[PDB]
Design a protein around this ligand. Structure first.
Ligand SMILES: Cc1ccc(-c2cc3c(NCP(=O)(O)O)ncnc3s2)cc1
Ligand SMILES: Cc1ccc(-c2cc3c(NCP(=O)(O)O)ncnc3s2)cc1
Lengths: 342, 342
């Protein structure tokens, strides 16, 4: 991977990200205990994932900038901005896991379930978000793209938070209501809640760092990348239930949780009224056999075939979008991502 | 009040703040349900207080700008930025009330305790914060002070969130530990958690709107205003227990809640070891008589006299600070605030 090549250097820069977010305030003995807590919060929640989003900033910056302008300090800013994208994500997850009452995240105890944390994790989460703008100011304050990146991350938060409201409205806990689970609503939630920050954000950020700041160039990249984000999430919903779980590690609780999955959406538009009932009675419940009987209704409806059909169509749609909207960015910016996700 | 004069026009602008935060997205039928939720969140949580912080932006802008540059649109931006300060506050309180497990706020049910809200209020809170930057962009994007205000509000969040961590570390729930309750720690919590956003923020914001953007001018105003914020909070802690409660409406649960109040701090530095014990045994507990016996130990120690003594010293300290650090701002900027708080 062009990712495994830059990965080491990405994770190693984290030590410096942290030093700087705790050292810059060495003039204030008074708040040392809060800054220690902050460190623990950064270490527990920004570390442990694959870093795909943050790393995309770095890879894209390398492909976008003329190599004579990749001086040591330019790269340091790319690593730093990649970590900003990872902290934005760590803010969202720490807060989501509290809202979902999740137990674990990456098979580790969620931060809010640790002894002594509880709902204080709400402030911790907000602190992760604040670190983003601290780092931008520390590293990028003099740069012509400074304001551009501030606005991009604030817009990234807002889109995500809007998509979270939409999700929450669409799939309450303690409420089966499949009338909400439409195709338009599904695409909407995906686009606002995950595709903007997961896919648009990191390429956009490298684009601004590269001086590529035109509205049209960004609109064009966004068209391709929101489309990829849509596919990524649909594949996430398919795997949840059909992914061989040793190939994931996770085990899908989508159905138990009344999630607006891609599966239940397709299911609903493909179902005589007797089918509705079996779903209306088994969706969003805890026991194995009532969750086995939904997996059975999906298998019975060749939704795995439907997915494979969707994955094929989607891949040629994305490639046509690259052909049509990538220029004047090197198509490889988008092709590297397409390769990771297909 | 110079406040009651501009108040009406402040509260009336809220209708427009909301229209604009829900109308600007009329191109996106898809997210209408999230935007309705947002409206409800704004209406329930940004309305109902006295608006002292937001109004300070407006009053200060009027005293700082030459009146030939107070065109209709300039004022609209001042009203809007005042509402930004109120939304920053509404974000903090919605989240604090969740962390504290509070029941009511302004004698109304906290937003997170409303049926159907619960911990979704965490996203709602974050949405209040995001509205700030949406409004700044909508109203102030072309202005030379734009970036200055963005940075000021992000710094205001960060300071507050840091002070919240400090508070949370200092006064856990389920932990009497008076060893943490020192004078230095109290001043620290107050300065970071409430004085920066309550007092520095709104004057600073008007200063930038006025073109007053020098680091020295801001450092000077900050010295005066963090000092006022310290006093305001100390008076808040005194009143909690001794304020005639018809003059407040509230009724102080500081002692029950193991709060790092100004009172328990003074108490501790003024106490033989037998006194420590009575406090160590009665602080942070629920029943009336164990809370009556702390109020008794305070009265017994002439802490009300101590306060009145502190209030006198404080008022001349502030006035000397105004004399010394106000220029070239009109001293009235600071004197109006001193008048509200003393
Ligand atoms: C911008 C970007 C780039 C790549 C990804 C990927 C996530 C992921 C993945 N997800 C595991 P995860 O649930 O994201 O830890 N599994 C296998 N391949 C990939 S590629 C996500 C976002
Ligand atoms: C910038 C600024 C200006 C004024 C205030 C005041 C709050 C307040 C007050 N507080 C009642 P509150 O608990 O703030 O609703 N009560 C009486 N006078 C005042 S003045 C707080 C902040």
């Amino acid at each position: 991977d062009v990712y495994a090549q830059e990965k080491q250097d990405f994770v190693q820069h984290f030590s410096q990200i942290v030093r700087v977010l705790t050292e810059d305030e060495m003039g204030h003995p008074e708040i040392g205990d809060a800054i220690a807590r902050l460190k623990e919060v950064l270490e527990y929640n920004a570390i442990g994932g694959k870093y795909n989003r943050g790393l995309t900033v770095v890879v894209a910056f390398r492909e976008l900038v003329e190599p004579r302008k990749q001086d040591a300090d330019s790269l340091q800013r790319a690593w730093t901005v990649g970590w900003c994208v990872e902290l934005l994500q760590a803010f969202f997850l720490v807060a989501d896991d509290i809202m979902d009452s999740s137990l674990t995240r990456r098979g580790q105890i969620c931060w809010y379930q640790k002894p002594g944390v509880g709902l204080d994790a709400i402030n911790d989460a907000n602190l992760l978000e604040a670190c983003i703008y601290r780092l931008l100011k520390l590293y990028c304050r003099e740069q012509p793209y400074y304001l551009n990146l501030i606005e991009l991350f604030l817009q990234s938060s807002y889109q995500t938070e809007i998509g979270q409201t939409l999700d929450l409205l669409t799939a309450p806990q303690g409420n089966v209501d499949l009338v909400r689970f439409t195709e338009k609503r599904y695409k909407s939630i995906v686009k606002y809640k995950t595709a903007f920050y997961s896919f648009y954000l990191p390429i956009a950020a490298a684009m601004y760092m590269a001086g590529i700041d035109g509205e049209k160039e960004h609109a064009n990249a966004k068209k391709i990348l929101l489309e990829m984000g849509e596919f990524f999430q649909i594949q996430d919903d398919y795997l949840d239930l059909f992914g061989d779980p040793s190939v994931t590690g996770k085990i899908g609780t989508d159905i138990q949780d009344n999630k607006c999955s891609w599966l239940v959406v397709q299911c609903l538009q493909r179902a005589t009224p007797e089918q509705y009932q079996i779903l209306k009675e088994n969706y969003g419940q805890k026991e194995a056999e009532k969750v086995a009987r939904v997996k059975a209704l999906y298998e019975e409806l060749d939704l795995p075939a439907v997915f494979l059909q969707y994955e094929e169509d989607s891949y040629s749609h994305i490639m046509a979008l690259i052909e049509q909207y990538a220029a004047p960015l090197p198509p490889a910016v988008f092709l590297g991502l397409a390769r990771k996700i297909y």
